[PDB]
Amino acid sequence: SVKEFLAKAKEDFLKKWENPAQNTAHLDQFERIKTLGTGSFGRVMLVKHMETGNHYAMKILDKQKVVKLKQIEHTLNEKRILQAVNFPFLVKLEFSFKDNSNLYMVMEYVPGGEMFSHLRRIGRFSEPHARFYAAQIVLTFEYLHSLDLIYRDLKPENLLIDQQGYIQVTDFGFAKRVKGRTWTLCGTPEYLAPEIILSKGYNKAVDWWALGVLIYEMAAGYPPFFADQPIQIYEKIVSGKVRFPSHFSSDLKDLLRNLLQVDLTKRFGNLKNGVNDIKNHKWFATTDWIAIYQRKVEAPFIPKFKGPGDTSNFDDYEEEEIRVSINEKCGKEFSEF
Amino acid sequence: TTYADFIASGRTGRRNAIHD
Ligand SMILES: CN(C)c1ccc(O)c(C(=O)c2ccc(C(=O)N[C@@H]3CCCNC[C@H]3NC(=O)c3ccncc3)cc2)c1
């Protein structure tokens, strides 16, 4: 039945994966309201779909900037994977399109804000609160890894909280469909597995290393490995000398020693029993895995939400008006988009 | 403390990814 749900969700993914949705909307169907977040090539904005009055989150990416950074293929990955997945804790793509200057992905608007904001403000989450979140990621990675996807950029920044207190993963920019191994040095420094850092070739197990980082950060309020300069972060990751706060329970410490494990023959999520080694661990004993999937666990934190189009759970950003050039930019490079 | 060392660091804001 876990096995039966995954074979069905696999047929549904491959259909969309082999024949991606293209050009299902246009810019002038949306009113741009406010910037919710940025990245190297643009921004995600609260928008209003004018024909329905629905709010969405629209990612805008400047194609020339994508090319100047040699990231064409990672952006195509991002859109092809996003349009094809479907799981309760993945942010759902409604539309995508492009014009002369830009790429556009209209997503579900997730009004509760980034986990990163709440984590920093509150300082840290108690163990039950972190577990609640962790369990969602464990199921999301179970789903993704079954499709042969690696996510590769897990962090509080990409984990949005929706109206009922649940997670929506965003920012699939480093997501990639890989049977076998891959070698790109990419990720967030704090979250990178040792094998990514050592240029070794890696697989989906780098996501499970990252899960250990996240849990650790959720529960302590700081990540297991940090320092002012990325190079110093990587020195500490390759040493793999983790110190735990005294408040971490002995079950948590034991989960984390098995996730933040340098040796792939011993890292949880990568072994014979795969993901079940994580679900059947003591720290998750009070976790009802089917109730998490079905959204029927009470969330420990329900965001304040004073009406649609309200953006109070997000930081403020400089706005920049969109320009659409009269000439097509980089048309062949983004032709499948 | 570890906490104070973190808050005093340059790494408590949003973190950007590295890449190829
Ligand atoms: C390889 N690199 C540089 C890369 C790869 C793929 C990409 O899409 C980009 C981008 O330029 C990019 C452009 C914009 C964003 C962006 O604004 N993402 C926000 C803010 C950064 C932290 N992640 C959360 C994300 N927010 C959301 O996606 C969001 C969705 C729904 N409701 C609220 C929020 C992220 C990435 C850059």
Coordinates of all heavy atoms in Angstrom, one line a residue, chain A residues 201-261, unseen atoms left out:
Chain A
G201 N 31.2 12.3 -6.4 CA 30.1 11.7 -7.1 C 29.2 11.3 -6.0 O 29.7 10.7 -5.0
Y202 N 27.9 11.6 -6.1 CA 27.0 11.3 -5.0 C 25.7 11.0 -5.6 O 25.4 11.1 -6.8 CB 27.0 12.5 -4.1 CG 26.7 13.9 -4.7 CD1 25.3 14.3 -4.9 CD2 27.7 14.7 -5.2 CE1 25.0 15.5 -5.5 CE2 27.3 15.9 -5.8 CZ 26.0 16.3 -5.9 OH 25.6 17.5 -6.5
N203 N 24.8 10.5 -4.7 CA 23.4 10.3 -5.1 C 22.4 10.9 -4.0 O 22.7 11.9 -3.4 CB 23.2 8.8 -5.2 CG 23.5 8.0 -3.9 OD1 23.7 8.6 -2.8 ND2 23.7 6.7 -4.0
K204 N 21.2 10.3 -3.9 CA 20.1 10.9 -3.1 C 20.5 11.0 -1.6 O 19.8 11.7 -0.9 CB 18.8 10.1 -3.3 CG 18.9 8.5 -3.4
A205 N 21.5 10.3 -1.2 CA 21.9 10.3 0.2 C 22.3 11.6 0.7 O 22.3 11.9 1.9 CB 22.9 9.3 0.5
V206 N 22.7 12.5 -0.2 CA 23.1 13.9 0.2 C 21.8 14.7 0.8 O 22.0 15.6 1.6 CB 23.7 14.7 -0.9 CG1 24.9 14.1 -1.5 CG2 22.7 15.0 -2.0
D207 N 20.6 14.3 0.3 CA 19.4 14.8 0.9 C 19.2 14.4 2.3 O 18.7 15.2 3.1 CB 18.2 14.4 0.0 CG 18.0 15.3 -1.2 OD1 18.6 16.4 -1.3 OD2 17.3 14.8 -2.2
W208 N 19.5 13.2 2.6 CA 19.3 12.7 4.0 C 20.3 13.3 4.9 O 20.1 13.4 6.1 CB 19.4 11.1 4.0 CG 18.3 10.4 3.3 CD1 18.5 9.5 2.3 CD2 16.9 10.6 3.6 NE1 17.3 9.1 1.9 CE2 16.3 9.7 2.7 CE3 16.2 11.3 4.4 CZ2 14.9 9.6 2.6 CZ3 14.8 11.2 4.4 CH2 14.1 10.3 3.5
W209 N 21.6 13.5 4.5 CA 22.6 14.3 5.3 C 21.9 15.6 5.6 O 21.9 16.0 6.8 CB 23.9 14.5 4.5 CG 24.8 15.4 5.2 CD1 24.8 16.7 5.2 CD2 25.9 15.0 6.1 NE1 25.8 17.2 6.0 CE2 26.5 16.2 6.5 CE3 26.4 13.8 6.5 CZ2 27.6 16.2 7.4 CZ3 27.5 13.8 7.3 CH2 28.1 14.9 7.8
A210 N 21.4 16.3 4.6 CA 20.8 17.6 4.7 C 19.6 17.6 5.7 O 19.4 18.6 6.4 CB 20.3 18.1 3.3
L211 N 18.9 16.5 5.8 CA 17.8 16.3 6.7 C 18.3 16.4 8.1 O 17.7 17.0 9.0 CB 17.0 15.0 6.5 CG 16.0 14.8 7.7 CD1 14.9 15.8 7.7 CD2 15.3 13.4 7.5
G212 N 19.4 15.7 8.4 CA 20.1 15.8 9.7 C 20.5 17.3 10.0 O 20.4 17.7 11.1
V213 N 21.0 18.0 9.0 CA 21.3 19.4 9.3 C 20.1 20.2 9.7 O 20.1 20.9 10.6 CB 22.0 20.0 8.0 CG1 22.3 21.5 8.3 CG2 23.3 19.3 7.7
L214 N 19.0 20.0 9.0 CA 17.8 20.7 9.2 C 17.2 20.5 10.6 O 17.0 21.4 11.3 CB 16.7 20.4 8.1 CG 15.3 21.0 8.2 CD1 15.4 22.4 7.6 CD2 14.4 20.2 7.3
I215 N 17.1 19.2 10.9 CA 16.5 18.8 12.2 C 17.4 19.5 13.3 O 16.9 20.1 14.2 CB 16.5 17.3 12.3 CG1 15.5 16.6 11.4 CG2 16.3 16.8 13.7 CD1 15.6 15.1 11.2
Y216 N 18.7 19.4 13.1 CA 19.6 19.9 14.1 C 19.4 21.4 14.2 O 19.4 22.0 15.3 CB 21.1 19.6 13.7 CG 22.1 20.1 14.6 CD1 23.0 19.2 15.3 CD2 22.3 21.4 14.9 CE1 23.9 19.6 16.3 CE2 23.2 21.9 15.8 CZ 24.0 21.0 16.5 OH 24.9 21.6 17.3
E217 N 19.4 22.1 13.1 CA 19.1 23.5 13.1 C 17.8 23.9 13.8 O 17.7 24.8 14.5 CB 19.3 24.1 11.7 CG 19.2 25.6 11.8 CD 19.4 26.3 10.4 OE1 20.2 25.8 9.6 OE2 18.8 27.4 10.2
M218 N 16.7 23.1 13.4 CA 15.4 23.4 14.0 C 15.4 23.3 15.5 O 14.8 24.2 16.1 CB 14.4 22.4 13.4 CG 14.1 22.6 11.9 SD 12.6 21.9 11.3 CE 13.1 20.2 11.3
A219 N 16.1 22.4 16.0 CA 16.1 22.1 17.4 C 17.0 22.8 18.3 O 16.8 23.0 19.5 CB 16.3 20.6 17.6
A220 N 18.1 23.3 17.7 CA 19.2 24.1 18.4 C 19.1 25.5 18.2 O 19.4 26.3 19.0 CB 20.6 23.6 18.0
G221 N 18.5 25.9 17.0 CA 18.5 27.3 16.5 C 19.7 27.7 15.7 O 19.7 28.9 15.2
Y222 N 20.7 26.8 15.6 CA 21.8 27.1 14.7 C 22.2 25.7 14.1 O 21.9 24.7 14.6 CB 23.0 27.7 15.6 CG 23.3 26.9 16.9 CD1 24.1 25.8 16.8 CD2 22.9 27.4 18.1 CE1 24.4 25.1 18.0 CE2 23.1 26.7 19.3 CZ 23.9 25.5 19.2 OH 24.2 24.8 20.4
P223 N 22.9 25.7 13.0 CA 23.3 24.5 12.3 C 24.5 23.8 12.9 O 25.2 24.5 13.6 CB 23.6 25.0 10.9 CG 24.2 26.4 11.1 CD 23.5 26.9 12.3
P224 N 24.7 22.5 12.7 CA 25.8 21.8 13.3 C 27.2 22.3 12.9 O 28.1 22.0 13.6 CB 25.6 20.3 12.8 CG 24.7 20.4 11.6 CD 23.9 21.6 11.8
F225 N 27.3 23.0 11.7 CA 28.6 23.4 11.1 C 28.4 24.8 10.6 O 27.7 25.1 9.6 CB 29.0 22.5 10.0 CG 29.0 21.0 10.3 CD1 28.0 20.2 9.8 CD2 30.0 20.4 11.1 CE1 28.0 18.8 10.0 CE2 30.0 19.1 11.3 CZ 29.0 18.3 10.8
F226 N 29.1 25.8 11.2 CA 29.1 27.2 10.8 C 30.3 28.0 11.1 O 31.2 27.6 11.9 CB 27.8 27.8 11.3 CG 27.9 28.2 12.8 CD1 28.5 29.4 13.2 CD2 27.4 27.4 13.8 CE1 28.6 29.7 14.5 CE2 27.4 27.7 15.1 CZ 28.1 28.9 15.5
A227 N 30.4 29.1 10.5 CA 31.6 29.9 10.6 C 31.4 31.0 9.6 O 30.5 30.9 8.7 CB 32.9 29.1 10.3
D228 N 32.3 32.1 9.6 CA 32.0 33.2 8.8 C 32.2 33.1 7.3 O 31.6 33.8 6.5 CB 32.9 34.4 9.4 CG 32.3 35.1 10.6 OD1 31.0 35.2 10.7 OD2 33.0 35.5 11.6
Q229 N 33.1 32.1 6.9 CA 33.5 32.0 5.5 C 33.1 30.5 5.1 O 33.4 29.6 5.8
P230 N 32.5 30.3 3.9 CA 32.2 29.0 3.4 C 33.4 27.9 3.5 O 33.1 26.8 3.9 CB 31.8 29.2 2.0 CG 31.1 30.5 2.0 CD 31.9 31.3 3.1
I231 N 34.6 28.3 3.2 CA 35.7 27.4 3.3 C 35.9 26.8 4.7 O 36.2 25.7 4.9 CB 37.0 28.0 2.7 CG1 38.3 27.2 3.1 CG2 37.2 29.5 3.2 CD1 39.5 27.5 2.2
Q232 N 35.6 27.6 5.7 CA 35.7 27.1 7.1 C 34.6 26.2 7.4 O 34.7 25.3 8.2 CB 35.7 28.3 8.1 CG 36.7 29.5 8.0 CD 36.2 30.6 8.9 OE1 35.7 31.7 8.4 NE2 36.4 30.4 10.2
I233 N 33.4 26.4 6.9 CA 32.3 25.5 7.0 C 32.6 24.2 6.5 O 32.3 23.2 7.1 CB 31.0 26.1 6.3 CG1 30.5 27.4 7.0 CG2 29.8 25.1 6.2 CD1 29.6 28.3 6.1
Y234 N 33.3 24.1 5.3 CA 33.6 22.8 4.7 C 34.6 22.1 5.4 O 34.6 20.8 5.5 CB 34.1 23.0 3.2 CG 33.3 23.9 2.3 CD1 33.9 24.8 1.4 CD2 31.9 23.9 2.3 CE1 33.2 25.6 0.6 CE2 31.1 24.8 1.5 CZ 31.8 25.6 0.6 OH 31.1 26.5 -0.2
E235 N 35.6 22.7 6.0 CA 36.6 22.1 6.9 C 35.9 21.4 8.1 O 36.1 20.2 8.3 CB 37.5 23.2 7.6 CG 39.0 23.4 7.1 CD 39.6 24.6 7.8 OE1 40.1 24.5 8.9 OE2 39.7 25.8 7.2
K236 N 35.0 22.1 8.7 CA 34.2 21.4 9.8 C 33.3 20.3 9.4 O 33.1 19.3 10.1 CB 33.4 22.5 10.6 CG 34.2 23.5 11.3 CD 33.4 24.7 11.8 CE 33.6 25.0 13.3 NZ 33.7 26.5 13.4
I237 N 32.7 20.4 8.2 CA 31.9 19.2 7.7 C 32.7 18.0 7.4 O 32.3 16.9 7.8 CB 31.1 19.6 6.4 CG1 30.0 20.7 6.8 CG2 30.4 18.4 5.8 CD1 29.5 21.4 5.6
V238 N 33.9 18.2 6.8 CA 34.7 17.0 6.5 C 35.4 16.4 7.8 O 35.6 15.2 7.8 CB 35.8 17.2 5.3 CG1 35.0 17.8 4.1 CG2 36.9 18.2 5.7
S239 N 35.6 17.2 8.8 CA 36.0 16.6 10.1 C 34.9 15.8 10.7 O 35.2 14.7 11.2 CB 36.4 17.7 11.1 OG 35.5 17.7 12.2
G240 N 33.7 16.2 10.6 CA 32.5 15.5 11.1 C 32.8 15.2 12.6 O 33.2 14.1 13.0
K241 N 32.8 16.3 13.4 CA 32.9 16.4 14.8 C 31.7 17.2 15.2 O 31.7 18.4 15.1 CB 34.2 17.0 15.3 CG 35.5 16.0 15.4 CD 36.8 16.7 15.6
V242 N 30.6 16.5 15.4 CA 29.4 17.3 15.8 C 29.3 17.4 17.3 O 29.5 16.4 18.0 CB 28.1 16.6 15.3 CG1 26.9 17.5 15.3 CG2 28.3 16.1 13.9
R243 N 29.0 18.6 17.8 CA 28.7 18.8 19.2 C 27.2 19.1 19.3 O 26.6 19.8 18.5 CB 29.4 20.0 19.8 CG 31.0 19.8 20.1
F244 N 26.6 18.5 20.2 CA 25.1 18.6 20.4 C 24.9 19.5 21.6 O 25.7 19.5 22.6 CB 24.5 17.3 20.6 CG 24.6 16.3 19.5 CD1 25.5 15.2 19.6 CD2 23.9 16.5 18.3 CE1 25.6 14.3 18.5 CE2 24.0 15.6 17.3 CZ 24.9 14.5 17.4
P245 N 23.8 20.3 21.6 CA 23.4 21.0 22.9 C 23.0 20.0 23.9 O 22.5 18.9 23.6 CB 22.3 21.9 22.4 CG 22.2 21.8 21.0 CD 22.9 20.6 20.5
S246 N 23.2 20.3 25.2 CA 22.8 19.5 26.3 C 21.3 19.2 26.3 O 20.8 18.1 26.7 CB 23.2 20.1 27.6 OG 22.7 21.5 27.7
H247 N 20.5 20.1 25.8 CA 19.0 19.9 25.8 C 18.5 18.9 24.8 O 17.4 18.4 25.0 CB 18.2 21.3 25.7 CG 18.5 22.0 24.4 ND1 17.9 21.7 23.2 CD2 19.2 23.2 24.2 CE1 18.3 22.6 22.3 NE2 19.0 23.5 22.8
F248 N 19.3 18.6 23.8 CA 18.9 17.5 22.8 C 18.8 16.2 23.6 O 19.7 15.8 24.2 CB 20.0 17.3 21.8 CG 20.0 18.3 20.6 CD1 19.3 19.5 20.6 CD2 20.7 17.9 19.4 CE1 19.3 20.3 19.5 CE2 20.7 18.8 18.3 CZ 20.0 20.0 18.4
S249 N 17.6 15.6 23.4 CA 17.3 14.3 24.0 C 18.2 13.2 23.3 O 18.6 13.4 22.1 CB 15.9 13.9 23.6 OG 15.7 13.5 22.3
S250 N 18.4 12.1 24.0 CA 19.3 11.0 23.6 C 18.8 10.3 22.3 O 19.7 9.8 21.6 CB 19.5 10.1 24.8 OG 19.3 8.7 24.4
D251 N 17.5 10.2 22.1 CA 16.9 9.8 20.8 C 17.3 10.7 19.6 O 17.7 10.3 18.6 CB 15.4 9.7 20.8 CG 14.9 8.7 21.8 OD1 15.5 7.7 22.1 OD2 13.8 8.9 22.4
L252 N 17.2 12.1 19.8 CA 17.6 13.0 18.8 C 19.1 12.9 18.4 O 19.4 12.8 17.3 CB 17.3 14.5 19.2 CG 17.6 15.6 18.2 CD1 17.0 15.3 16.8 CD2 17.0 16.9 18.7
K253 N 19.9 12.9 19.5 CA 21.3 12.8 19.2 C 21.6 11.5 18.4 O 22.4 11.6 17.5 CB 22.1 12.7 20.6 CG 22.0 14.0 21.5 CD 23.1 13.9 22.6 CE 22.6 13.5 24.1 NZ 23.6 13.0 25.1
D254 N 20.8 10.5 18.7 CA 21.1 9.2 18.0 C 20.6 9.2 16.5 O 21.3 8.6 15.7 CB 20.5 8.0 18.7 CG 20.8 6.6 18.0 OD1 21.9 6.1 18.3 OD2 20.0 6.1 17.2
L255 N 19.5 9.8 16.3 CA 19.0 10.1 14.9 C 20.1 10.8 14.1 O 20.4 10.5 13.0 CB 17.8 11.0 14.8 CG 16.6 10.7 13.9 CD1 16.0 11.9 13.3 CD2 17.0 9.7 12.7
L256 N 20.6 11.9 14.7 CA 21.5 12.8 14.1 C 22.9 12.2 13.8 O 23.5 12.5 12.8 CB 21.6 14.1 14.8 CG 20.3 15.0 14.9 CD1 20.5 16.2 15.8 CD2 19.8 15.4 13.5
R257 N 23.3 11.3 14.7 CA 24.6 10.7 14.5 C 24.5 9.7 13.3 O 25.4 9.5 12.6 CB 25.1 9.9 15.8 CG 25.6 10.8 16.9 CD 26.4 10.1 18.1 NE 25.4 9.7 19.1 CZ 25.2 10.3 20.3 NH1 26.0 11.3 20.7 NH2 24.3 9.8 21.1
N258 N 23.3 9.2 13.1 CA 23.1 8.3 11.9 C 22.7 9.1 10.6 O 22.9 8.5 9.5 CB 22.0 7.3 12.2 CG 22.4 6.1 13.3 OD1 22.0 6.2 14.4 ND2 23.1 5.1 12.8
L259 N 22.2 10.3 10.6 CA 22.0 11.1 9.4 C 23.2 11.8 9.0 O 23.6 11.7 7.9 CB 20.8 12.1 9.6 CG 19.4 11.5 9.6 CD1 18.3 12.5 10.1 CD2 19.0 11.1 8.2
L260 N 23.9 12.5 9.9 CA 25.1 13.2 9.7 C 26.3 12.3 9.9 O 27.2 12.4 10.7 CB 25.3 14.4 10.7 CG 24.2 15.4 10.9 CD1 24.5 16.3 12.1 CD2 23.9 16.2 9.6
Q261 N 26.3 11.3 9.0 CA 27.2 10.2 9.1 C 28.0 10.2 7.8 O 27.5 10.3 6.7 CB 26.4 8.8 9.1 CG 27.2 7.5 9.0 CD 28.4 7.5 10.0 OE1 29.5 7.8 9.7 NE2 28.0 7.0 11.2

